[PDB]
């Protein structure tokens, strides 16, 4: 069964693997994030309720009044989205917050408040999201791009090689909170443990232990195990568990029980450990040279004399043993400092520590954190107890506590947001364990260690900034509060919240202007994962590994769609099936595989879960039950693609599109292209302009439907039914009764957005693709947007392309185009320019909007009214007048009248005017005369534009040939576009050839149907040929149910197929070559894909037959009459005497540094002298040169450049006396 615009033109779908999970809604990141931000969600998480339950109830410092919270709300926007874009306002909503002030008496923690008051106060306006995932910030339509940042929670990083210049590794450990102070632990090459807070000075780390009220003995209890020396009959014997001797040299005689176990000289093996455990050896008598290097654990005091024997962490000598033996402390606890495993790092750090108690530890930490200003008991204790341990200024979130408990192998995952003693001690213990050998480091590119921020999280953080500023203001007003003469808007202020949230949505590194020239480009700018932004890395610094693809990107981030240039791999784009985890990580679908039978249930995993399991490959042959047809299958275990058994796997990939994104899964024959050319192909495919006549890719992938629907450029029907079709203004849909509400009788009236400006000056336009009185279903499309054709996605157009060299006109990457491409207007795109004119009151009275234009004669009053402003629609070009806008006293009158820029033509499509109340409306103040004029240039195609296919084959269209000179085959049809075969062996993008052959076969079927329907046959022969065309070959998913198309839906389908039968070649499970040959045999075309072609010039055959087919070629928006520029003489800058830069400023070319070196490389001394003195800078030289040229005397009078005298005055404006010496 199919829907009714699905039976219009059903695309022949190759593809063998049955898909189990349909594609999710492609804008779900933006929409789910912002629906989390604004939603009335009780239990508090997450949203605006989390912000209000953190900041409220505010109580002042015993001021006996406590403003509390009830509920919030967002009213209607005063401006709907269209008139909001037209006017220039934000698309926002007012945030109505109920606030309940209760005020206490004296001595009421428990007492009832003396008075209440409550009102629905107004704080800020928050910008709502449009239904397509965009904002409208100040007239312009912007997009917040989801960030990719390091997760909160501990990270054990190594930095193995570069420091110390000696090959000795370090090991640092960063506890990254979501909000607050950063705590890092780090070794130094003396093997001492150092703490630093917020990248400040370096403190030896155990001082933080001494700041947590730990004595030295408790610290040595934590990080060391005790070895017991018992004072006995002679020589102070030792308790010896045999584990401690692992891998060391026997220094003494190892004997017990009257038996010599191990003699001196040999190392202790594990067999000797087994001998000591079998022989039950604990107590052995040691020599006095064994204790002469060990370190005491706890303190001991001489009992009778009443003084100290030795402090804790003191090494022992023989006379120290003579001190402690004669006193009466029989047990001696020593620190086992194994050189192999259990290193003495804490103990040597305690030897570095200049402190002894808790108070001096806090004084040293306070002198680290805030220097100069004195360290007193209260101040240092409040500092250190609010560094990590208060809920205000330090908060690992739920993500942070999950990562923090997971990296320490804790059992639980939910806990308190602050740290504790035990958490810092566990981070130090795991760091020491990593130094000892057990456990390993973490990598930072691993996407289980890399969280995503999105729109709701970022706006919530900015809103929390605004709320803590307004609670500091409420605490300000309340202690100065007199009662009862205030109601809660003398306390609260709507200004800081609105200021902060408009600061983020207006001027941030991620709230950025939407790439809007294409439905693909909208839908792939909204699905973007940037590594940049606040708190993340920068473009010009890092690095090599964060720019590189890591094995956790499989199914989370597209491997091949990343922009080339200065930021590669920082601006990653999200995969097709990848959702976002509850904690913000990237979870991708897999199919749960209990045993041999691969089950059709799906189950989502992130990269810290994908490593443990064994996950299969998407295309592994399984037949009729889910059993893998082989006994061994390629899977990947822990980021390592390896071959495993038939019955070991726990998950399988869902579908074979899932590695790549929605930009680079629209490329058919992706698997035959190179990776580089797929990258260039996807990045150029974002850049296509919408043509005037949208044209249905013959070789698509079937993902065109989901992109063209899910990006909101088409008018998808909300409720199904029939149609009334007034449509000149709006589609009117009568609703079927089952989908129709009992009250609100109701018929749906869709607004078509006609010719208007996009963000990239292209033309967004919707056209109805349903007739009058025609059934439509829910979810069906009604109006085709820009670059769409019956709900599919038509960026460029499909044209007949020959691969051959043609007389040099397609030399490096150029492209030679017939005249049939430019006669049919099949790339003639439509651009729209907005031009503003204002008549602000700068000085000497206000400016004026009158046709009575001066000096200039009846060449002003022309495309305007009888007395002012461009009339409505003519063919205006360059140098015309649109809005007469000139003042008197500015003879002394002048011409600021906004005219048409140089080089452009067009038709005035619209004139908007919300001018200074007097022009003879709704807008803001200040600005007076506000006249916006919308031109619409129609640019065709010309030598110099840029076209490209989908595979990375760029081209600048070189010669626009006549129809006659084209290479025609023996049937008579010219070929449209000639490309060059030499690009194909080097640039290994062989997929464009299979697209060429399969598009040739598609139009072969289209020509066959066009013959069977033009030379008109009764519909039995058409339905037989359509059935043969839709069966065609191997086991596929489509077949068709064609005998249920009522003898008319066969004919309407065959009316929509006579331009070529559309073929879906999916991404990695595409059409094989034998099916291309078999489809080329169904059409009457030659099997090789190659036709003999004659030459239009000479009429004689090209030897060695050439390839002709249909490639889907796109017109990119790098048009040549936006790049052509020239300057002889005009205006310059102010500070310098050199020319201005750019095209919108009529400026000249920067003759840079390497061009000066290139002229020095020749003998061009005079060319360089005029290149930097006369042509550029020296004012007397250039006026004398212009007069010398127009007299007919090519001679320069050089002089000295002006910018060098600017250099002299800037150097001389220091204390520097730079001069110019003798004649």
């Amino acid at each position: 069964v199919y829907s009714y615009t699905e039976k219009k033109r059903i695309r022949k779908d190759f593809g063998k693997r049955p898909q189990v999970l349909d594609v999710p809604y492609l804008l779900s990141i933006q929409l789910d994030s912002f629906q989390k931000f604004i939603e009335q969600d009780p239990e508090g998480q997450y949203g605006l309720e989390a912000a209000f339950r953190s900041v409220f109830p505010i109580q002042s410092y015993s001021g006996n009044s406590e403003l509390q919270y009830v509920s919030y709300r967002l009213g209607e926007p005063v401006f709907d989205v269209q008139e909001c874009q037209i006017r220039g306002v934000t698309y926002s909503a007012p945030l109505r917050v109920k606030l309940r002030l209760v005020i206490y008496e004296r001595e009421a923690p428990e007492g009832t408040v003396k008075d209440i008051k409550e009102q629905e106060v107004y704080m800020g306006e928050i910008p709502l999201m449009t239904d397509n995932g965009t904002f409208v910030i100040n007239g312009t339509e912007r997009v917040i791009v989801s960030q990719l940042h390091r997760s909160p929670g501990v990270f054990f990083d190594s930095d193995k090689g570069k420091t110390h210049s000696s090959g000795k590794v370090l090991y640092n450990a960063r506890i990254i909170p979501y909000r607050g102070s950063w705590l890092d632990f780090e070794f130094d090459p003396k093997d001492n443990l150092f703490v630093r807070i917020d990248r400040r000075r370096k403190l030896p780390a155990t001082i933080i232990l001494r700041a947590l009220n730990y004595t030295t003995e408790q610290i040595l209890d934590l990080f060391f195990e005790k070895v017991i020396f018992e004072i006995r009959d002679n020589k102070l014997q030792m308790e010896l568990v045999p584990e401690r001797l692992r891998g060391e040299t026997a220094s003494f005689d190892i004997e017990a029980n009257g038996k010599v176990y191990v003699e001196k000289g040999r190392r202790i093996t594990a067999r000797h450990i087994r001998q000591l455990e079998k022989d039950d050896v604990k107590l052995i008598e040691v020599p006095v040279e064994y204790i002469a290097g060990k370190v005491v654990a706890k303190d001991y005091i001489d009992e009778s004399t009443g003084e100290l024997i030795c402090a804790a962490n003191m090494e022992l000598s023989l006379d120290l043993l003579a001190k402690l033996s004669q006193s009466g402390h029989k047990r001696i606890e020593t620190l086992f400092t194994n050189d192999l495993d259990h290193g003495p790092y804490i103990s040597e750090t305690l030897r570095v520590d200049p402190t002894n108690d808790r108070l001096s530890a806090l004084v040293e930490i306070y002198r680290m954190m805030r220097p100069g200003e004195p360290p007193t008991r209260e101040a240092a204790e409040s500092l250190f107890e609010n560094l990590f341990f208060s809920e205000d200024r330090y908060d690992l979130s739920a993500v942070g506590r999950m990562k923090f408990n997971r990296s320490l192998l804790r059992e639980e995952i939910e806990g308190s947001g602050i740290l504790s003693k035990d958490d810092i001690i566990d981070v130090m213990k795991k760091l020491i364990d990593i130094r000892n050998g057990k456990g390993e480091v973490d990598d930072i590119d691993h996407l289980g260690n890399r969280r995503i921020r999105s729109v709701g999280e970022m706006a919530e953080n900015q809103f929390r900034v605004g709320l803590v500023r307004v609670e500091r203001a409420v605490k300000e007003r309340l202690s100065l509060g007199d009662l009862d003469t205030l109601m809660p808007q003398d306390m609260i202020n709507a200004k800081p919240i609105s200021a902060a949230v408009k600061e983020f949505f207006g001027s941030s590194q991620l709230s950025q202007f939407m790439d809007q020239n294409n439905p693909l480009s909208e839908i792939t700018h909204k699905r973007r994962i940037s590594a940049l932004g606040p708190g993340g890395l920068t473009r010009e610094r890092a690095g090599f590994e964060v720019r590189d693809v890591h094995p956790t990107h499989y199914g989370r981030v597209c491997p091949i769609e990343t922009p080339e240039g200065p930021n590669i791999g920082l601006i990653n784009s999200l995969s097709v099936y990848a959702q976002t985890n509850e904690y913000g990580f990237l979870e991708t679908p897999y199919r749960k595989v209990t045993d041999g039978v691969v089950t059709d249930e799906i189950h989502y995993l992130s990269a810290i879960e994908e490593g443990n399991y064994v996950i299969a490959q998407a295309n592994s042959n399984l037949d009729e039950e889910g059993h893998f047809v082989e006994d061994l299958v390629t899977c990947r275990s822990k980021g390592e693609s390896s071959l495993f058994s038939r019955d070991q796997v726990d998950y399988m990939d869902v579908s074979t599109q899932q590695v790549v994104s929605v930009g680079a899964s629209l490329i058919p024959f992706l698997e035959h292209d190179d990776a580089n050319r797929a990258l260039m192909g996807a990045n150029m495919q974002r850049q296509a302009v919408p043509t005037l006549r949208a044209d249905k890719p013959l070789v698509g992938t079937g993902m065109e439907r989901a992109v063209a629907v899910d990006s909101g450029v088409t008018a998808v029907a909300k409720r199904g039914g029939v149609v009334q079709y007034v449509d000149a203004s709006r589609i009117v849909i009568k609703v079927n009764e089952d989908e129709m509400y009992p009250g609100e009788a109701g018929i749906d009236i869709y607004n078509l957005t006609k010719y208007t400006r996009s963000n990239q000056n292209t033309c967004i336009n919707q056209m109805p693709c349903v007739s009058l009185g025609e059934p439509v279903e829910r979810g069906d499309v009604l109006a085709d947007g820009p670059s769409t054709d019956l709900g599919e996605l038509a960026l460029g157009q499909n044209m007949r392309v020959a691969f051959m060299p043609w007389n040099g006109y397609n030399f490096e990457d150029s492209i030679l185009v017939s005249e049939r491409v430019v006669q049919e207007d099949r790339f003639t795109t439509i651009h729209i320019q907005e031009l503003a004119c204002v008549s602000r009151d700068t000085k000497l009275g206000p400016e004026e909007i009158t046709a009575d234009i001066p000096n200039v004669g009846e060449a002003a009053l022309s495309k305007l009214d009888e007395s002012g402003i461009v009339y409505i629609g003519a063919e205006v070009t360059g140098g015309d007048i649109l809005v007469g806008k000139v003042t008197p006293k500015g003879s002394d009158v002048k011409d600021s009248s906004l005219r048409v820029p140089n080089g452009v033509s067009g038709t005035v499509i619209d004139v908007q005017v919300f001018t200074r109340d007097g022009v003879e409306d709704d807008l803001a103040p200040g600005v007076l005369k506000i006249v916006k004029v919308y031109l619409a240039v129609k640019r065709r195609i010309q030598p110099g534009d840029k076209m490209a296919g989908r595979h990375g084959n760029k081209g600048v269209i070189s010669k626009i040939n006549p129809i006659e000179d084209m290479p025609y085959d023996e049937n008579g049809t010219p070929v449209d576009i000639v490309l060059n075969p030499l690009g194909v062996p080097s640039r290994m993008n062989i997929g464009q050839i299979l697209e060429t052959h399969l598009g040739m076969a598609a139009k072969g079927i289209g020509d066959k149907i066009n013959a069977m329907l033009k030379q008109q046959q009764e519909v039995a022969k058409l339905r037989e040929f359509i059935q043969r065309a839709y069966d065609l070959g191997a086991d596929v998913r489509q077949k068709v149910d064609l005998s249920t198309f009522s003898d008319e839906e066969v004919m309407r389908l065959a009316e929509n197929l006579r331009k070529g039968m559309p073929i879906a070649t999916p991404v990695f499970d595409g059409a094989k070559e034998a099916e291309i040959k078999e489809l080329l045999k169904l059409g009457d075309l030659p099997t090789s894909g190659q036709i003999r072609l004659y030459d239009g010039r000479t009429g004689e055959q090209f030897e060695r037959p050439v390839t002709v087919g249909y490639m889907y070629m796109l017109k990119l928006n790098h048009l040549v009459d936006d790049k052509m520029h020239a300057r002889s003489t005009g205006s310059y800058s102010l500070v310098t005497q050199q020319p201005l830069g750019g095209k919108a400023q009529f400026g000249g070319q920067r003759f840079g540094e390497m061009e000066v070196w290139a002229l020095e490389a020749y003998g061009a001394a005079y060319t360089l002298q005029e290149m930097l003195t006369v042509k550029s800078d020296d004012v007397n030289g250039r006026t004398k040169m212009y007069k010398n040229i127009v007299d007919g005397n090519h001679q320069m009078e050089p002089g000295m450049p002006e910018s060098f005298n600017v250099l002299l005055k800037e150097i001389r404006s220091l204390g520097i006396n730079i001069e110019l010496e003798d004649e």
């Binding site: 000066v1156 020095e1160 020749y1162 003998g1163 061009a1164 001394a1165 005079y1166 360089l1168 002298q1169 930097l1172 003195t1173 800078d1177 020296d1178 050089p1198 002089g1199 000295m1200 450049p1201 060098f1204 150097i1211 520097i1216 010496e1221």
Partner: protein, 66 residues
């Protein structure tokens, strides 16, 4: 090395158009240094003929007529 050798030149404009200008201008200022131009980039700065190419005859003439 090449950056230490181009910053240690007897012509401070040649060593100031290149890397750090603060160090070189204070060294030249407190030394009272003087720049007998005599190279390519001093004459690209000060706006005259290069003493290499076509301008080598001009600089022969000017060096002869002193």
């Amino acid at each position: 090395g090449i950056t230490k050798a181009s910053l240690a030149t007897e012509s401070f404009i040649s060593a100031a158009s290149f890397q750090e200008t603060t160090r070189v201008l204070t060294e030249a200022a407190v030394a009272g240094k003087r720049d007998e131009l005599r190279g390519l980039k001093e004459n690209v700065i000060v706006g005259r003929l290069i003493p290499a190419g076509t301008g080598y005859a001009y600089h022969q003439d000017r060096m002869r007529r002193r």
